[PDB]
From a paper:
Genetically encoded calcium indicators based on truncated troponin C are attractive probes for calcium imaging due to their relatively small molecular size and twofold reduced calcium ion buffering. However, the best‐suited members of this family, YTnC and cNTnC, suffer from low molecular brightness, limited dynamic range, and/or poor sensitivity to calcium transients in neurons. To overcome these limitations, we developed an enhanced version of YTnC, named YTnC2.
Compared with YTnC, YTnC2 had 5.7‐fold higher molecular brightness and 6.4‐fold increased dynamic range in vitro. YTnC2 was successfully used to reveal calcium transients in the cytosol and in the lumen of mitochondria of both mammalian cells and cultured neurons. Finally, we obtained and analyzed the crystal structure of the fluorescent domain of the YTnC2 mutant.
Residue numbers in the entry: 5 to 68, 72 to 152, 208 to 306
Write the structure that this text describes.
């Protein structure tokens, strides 16, 4: 009913493009898949098109679409991310890795005709060649210490620890913001903290629903395509809103 809902109504094709430079190690990632807001579901296959990804794939999960979360009927007024469509929104993060480097990220999420686009620039700085990021020491998971076709999607995510990020309004920016923590596991059994600060602004001039403070609840699953030669990641995210 409200701005930009009808654009999400079925199966929306996704395009993700990313270019990155972490300590001078240059890389590109492209990818495609599908968002289904009615399920709060996202599925992607993202490929490193330049060869070996120089950071661990788990560290880019958050960077590589809150518009595909499913907002319940009582909360459709708080859906900032759909309300900004089709023109879209700039998503900006700082990510601090404890006792290591950090990422700066800037992405534009928007409709390019039918296709929902996440076009990203990533830089990162002050990493240790030998540390957990440029060392590739993180495990490959995101386990943070229609009734039918849908239940197939939910099967892959049942059991995974949920992760809740609080979304707050920023009136000055006519946007939203969030602070959260991602605790990556390592193989050795300890944790790698990734301290996320996020800012989202509309690309359009005209106004938006600035939401009451609510949470987005995620479960993410990382897998592989068994027929894919390249360095790659399959990511599925189940995202719903609550708490207001």
């Amino acid at each position: 009913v409200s701005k930009g809902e009808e654009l999400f109504t079925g199966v929306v094709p996704i395009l993700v493009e990313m270019v990155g430079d972490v300590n001078g190690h240059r890389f590109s990632v492209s990818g495609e898949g599908e968002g289904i807001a009615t399920y709060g579901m996202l599925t992607l296959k993202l490929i490193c098109t330049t060869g070996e990804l120089p950071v661990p794939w788990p560290t880019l999960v958050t960077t590589l679409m809150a518009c595909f979360a499913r907002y319940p009927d009582h909360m459709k007024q708080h859906d900032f991310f759909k309300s900004a469509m089709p023109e879209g929104y700039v998503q900006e993060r700082t990510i601090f890795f404890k006792d290591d480097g950090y990422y700066k990220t800037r992405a534009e999420v928007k409709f390019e005709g039918d296709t929902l686009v996440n076009r990203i620039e990533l830089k990162g700085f002050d990493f240790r060649e030998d540390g957990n990021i440029l060392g590739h020491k993180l495990g490959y998971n995101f386990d943070l210490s229609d009734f039918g076709e849908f239940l197939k999607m939910v099967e892959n995510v049942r059991g995974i620890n949920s992760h809740s990020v609080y979304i707050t309004a920023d009136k000055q920016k006519n946007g939203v913001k969030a602070h959260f923590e991602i605790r990556h596991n390592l193989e050795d059994g300890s944790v790698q903290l990734a301290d996320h600060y996020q800012q989202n602004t509309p690309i359009g001039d005209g106004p938006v629903l600035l939401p009451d403070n609510h949470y987005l609840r995620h479960q993410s699953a990382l897998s592989k395509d068994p027929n894919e030669k390249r360095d790659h990641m399959v990511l599925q995210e189940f995202v719903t809103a609550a708490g207001i």
